[PDB]
Design a protein around this ligand. Structure first.
Ligand SMILES: [Mg+2]
Lengths: 408, 408
C-alpha cells in the first residue's frame, strides 16, 4: 500500500496550547489539574479538573463562535495548529485528497445543558434551530472540512476513551487504502460541565482528592482513586510518505500499526485481567509487523483507577513477558488528566513527540508506587532512543484501540 | 483483498420487523407513517412519524431493559435478527474474528431527555449512575459485543444521515484488511421524542402534512415539504467470501464499493448542485472497479426535501449523464421515512434484497412528479435483474457516503 507518516501536531491541552508548549510542559512534569473555574462546582463531590486556557477569538471569528459548541471550537483550534505545525496551506493541497476525521466521546455537552433548559422552560418550539448542528458529534469533522474546503472523506468515530486512537487508526486506513493522501485526524472533548462531572461523580469513577488537585491523578500508585476529567483536543496531520517527501515535510514519525479488540465484558468495568487490552496490543504489533521485544515505550491508558491501572499492567506483562521488565511506561494522564474523546489523540501526540525528541515523558505523582505492578513507570523524564512505541486506549464499553509508532 | 458478501439481514423497521416482513411490505408499497403514539405530540407542529412496533421483551431479558436506551435495544433486536437470518449461532464462530460496527446519529435521546430533566429539577447529584453508559453512541456496538462475546474490533461511526453507509463501508474495510472475518454492522436510531422532533421542526427539516400521515413522505414530488422522522435499526452480516462459502451461507449480494466525500459547504444546507453527492457516487464506482454505464439501480437518499431531492437528482445526472435516463431510482423513505442514523443500513438491506430477489422496490406517493426531477422513480414494484446498484446517503454537515452492491 503506502507508508503513512505524522507531519503535523495540533495540541490543545490543560498544560499547554500548541504542540511545543505541550512537550516542554511534559518534560517539566507540569500538572493541568486545578479547582474548577469553568463553572461553580461547589455543590459537587468532585470539584477539580484539567481545564484549558485559550482565547478562541484568537483563532476563529468571534462572531461565528456563538454558533460553535466548545468541542467544535477546540477541534478547529487544534486543526489550525496542526496545519500550521505541518507547514501547509489548504491552497497548496488538493482539497479532494484531504480527509477529516476528528472524533469525540460526548459532543456538545454545554449545548445539551443550555437547550435542554430551554426545552423545559419554554417548550420544544423554542429550542434553537442550531441545537442539532451544534451538538452532534460529526460537526467537528464537518466544520474542519467546511473551513478549509477539504472534500475528501469526512467521518466521525465515537468510542468513548478509545475515540482518539480509533479515529487516527481509521485515518491510517483511509490513506493506506488510497481514499485520501492527507488527513486531519484526532479527537476533541469539552465535557467540563455540571451534568457531566456530576454523572461521572455519581458513577464513582472520579477522584475525590479536592484538597490536592495536582496530586489527584496518580496512576499506578497505591492511593489511586479514580480519574480526573480533562478537556482539549488533539489533531494530527497524517500523510502518505510519498506526499510528505515530495514537499520536503518534517516527519515526526511513522504510524505503522493499528490494533483493536473488544472486552465484551461489562458496560463500564474493564476486564480485570486486561484480556481485551492484551488482544488489542497484540494486534497492533502484528499489524505493524514487529515483535514484542522491538517496543521500548508504551504510552499507557493509565487513568488512575484500581481495576483499570492493574488490568493494563497485567495485559502488558502478558504480551511482553520477559520484555515487559525492559519497557518504559508512562501516563500522560498524570499531568493532563483524562481527556475522554480527546485522550487518544493528545496521547498519540505525546507518544510521537517522545520518539522524535528522544526523551520519554514522565508519570508524575508516582510517590507511592504499587509493588504489584512492577513496571518502569518513568517517574522522571528520560533520554532514550526507542525505535517503536505503543499508545494504549481501553474505553468504557470495552472498546480497545492501540497505535504503534515507529521512529523515523 | 478478500471479497465481502452480505449473508444476513436484520431489519427492524416502521413497516416490518424482520427482513422478510420488510420486503413484502416494500413491494406492497406500505406506509409506516402515522400519528405519533410514542408521546403526546399535540403541542408540536409535526405530529406524525414512522414508528416501529416491536416488543424488546421478545428478544432481550425484560429486567435488563430498564438500563438500556431504546437505540441500544433496537440494535440488539436487529443484531439478533441478522444472526438468525445468517443461520449463525454465537458459538459457530471464532469470537476473536467477529467485529461489531453499529452506528447511530444521536444515541440515547430518551436517556438525555429523562436525565437532563433530573439534572435541572433535582441537581447534578441526583443524576442516574446509568446515564453515561446508557446514552453514549458507542453502546450499541458494545452491547452487541457483550451479548455474544465478540472480541473482534468494536467501533462506532456517528455521521448523521450517512451513518448507516459509513458503518457498512467501514466494516467492509475491516474485513478486506483482515481485521475480522465477519462483522455485524449497520445503524440504529431512536429519536422520536418531544425534544428531537421539536428541534428538527424549528430547523424546518420536517414535513407538516399531519392531515395525511401516509402521504407526507413523497420524494421527488412537487409538493414535497420535508422529511418524516423514522426510527429502527438495520444490522447486516458482512462476511469474507471464503468464510461464507465454506460454511454454506446464503449470499444476498457482494459489497464491492464504498465512496465518501464532504460538501464542505454548509452546516445543514446540502450543496445545491449535488457536487459532494456526485463525487461520492463516482468514488464508490471506482472503488468497485466499475463504470457509470454498468449501474442499473440506485436506492436514493431521497428524503422528500425541496432542496435535498433536487440536489441528488442533479448529482445523479452529472455522474451518469445519458445513462441517468435508463437508471431505476427509488426511495425507501417514501415508505419508512428517514431513519436518520439507521437510514443507510436499512436502505442497504433494501438494495441487497432488490438484487437478490430481482425486484426493484417502488417510491410511493408519486402523485405529482416534479418536471424538474425527471428520472424513473419506480412508482410501481418492477421485476428486473440488475448486476450493480448504489445506495446513497447525503447528510446534514455535508457527509456523503455511497455503497455499491453486486448481484450474485
Ligand atoms: Mg402542513
Amino acid at each position: 500500500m503506502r507508508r503513512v507518516v505524522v507531519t503535523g501536531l495540533g495540541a490543545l491541552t490543560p498544560i499547554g496550547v500548541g504542540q511545543e508548549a505541550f512537550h516542554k510542559a511534559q518534560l517539566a512534569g507540569k500538572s493541568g489539574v486545578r479547582p474548577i473555574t469553568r463553572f461553580d462546582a461547589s455543590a459537587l463531590p468532585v470539584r477539580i479538573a484539567a481545564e484549558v486556557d485559550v482565547d478562541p477569538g484568537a483563532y476563529l471569528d468571534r462572531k461565528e463562535l456563538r454558533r460553535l459548541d466548545r468541542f467544535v471550537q477546540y477541534a478547529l483550534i487544534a486543526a489550525q495548529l496542526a496545519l500550521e505545525d505541518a507547514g501547509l496551506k489548504p491552497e497548496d493541497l488538493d482539497p479532494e485528497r484531504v480527509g477529516t476525521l476528528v472524533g469525540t466521546g460526548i459532543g456538545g455537552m454545554e449545548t445539551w445543558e443550555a437547550q435542554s433548559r430551554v426545552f423545559l422552560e419554554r417548550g420544544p418550539n423554542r429550542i434553537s434551530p442550531f441545537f442539532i448542528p451544534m451538538m452532534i458529534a460529526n460537526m467537528a469533522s464537518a466544520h474542519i472540512a467546511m473551513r478549509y474546503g477539504f472534500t475528501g472523506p469526512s467521518s466521525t468515530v465515537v468510542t468513548a476513551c478509545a475515540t482518539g486512537a480509533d479515529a487516527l487508526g481509521s485515518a491510517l486506513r483511509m490513506i493506506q487504502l488510497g481514499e485520501a493522501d492527507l488527513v486531519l485526524a484526532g479527537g476533541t472533548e469539552a465535557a467540563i460541565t455540571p451534568m457531566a462531572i456530576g454523572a461521572f461523580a455519581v458513577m464513582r469513577a472520579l477522584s475525590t482528592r479536592n484538597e490536592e488537585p495536582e496530586k489527584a491523578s496518580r496512576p499506578f500508585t497505591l492511593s489511586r482513586d479514580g480519574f480526573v476529567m480533562g478537556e482539549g483536543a488533539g489533531v494530527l496531520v497524517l500523510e502518505a510518505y510519498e506526499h510528505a517527501k515530495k514537499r520536503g515535510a518534517r516527519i515526526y514519525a511513522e504510524l505503522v500499526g493499528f490494533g483493536r479488540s473488544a472486552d465484551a465484558h461489562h458496560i463500564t468495568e474493564p476486564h480485570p485481567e486486561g484480556k481485551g487490552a492484551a488482544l488489542a496490543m497484540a494486534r497492533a504489533l502484528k499489524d505493524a509487523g514487529i515483535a514484542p521485544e522491538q517496543v521500548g515505550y508504551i504510552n499507557a491508558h493509565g487513568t488512575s483507577t484500581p481495576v483499570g491501572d492493574r488490568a493494563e499492567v497485567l495485559a502488558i506483562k502478558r504480551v511482553f513477558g520477559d520484555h515487559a521488565k525492559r519497557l518504559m511506561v508512562s501516563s500522560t494522564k498524570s499531568m493532563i488528566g483524562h481527556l475522554l474523546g480527546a485522550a487518544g489523540a493528545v496521547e498519540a501526540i505525546a507518544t510521537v513527540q517522545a520518539l522524535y525528541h528522544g526523551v520519554i515523558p514522565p508519570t508524575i505523582n508516582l510517590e507511592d508506587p504499587d509493588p504489584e505492578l512492577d513496571l518502569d513507570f518513568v517517574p522522571e523524564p528520560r533520554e532514550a532512543k526507542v525505535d517503536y512505541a505503543l499508545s494504549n486506549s481501553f474505553a468504557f464499553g470495552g472498546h480497545n484501540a492501540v497505535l504503534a509508532f515507529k521512529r523515523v
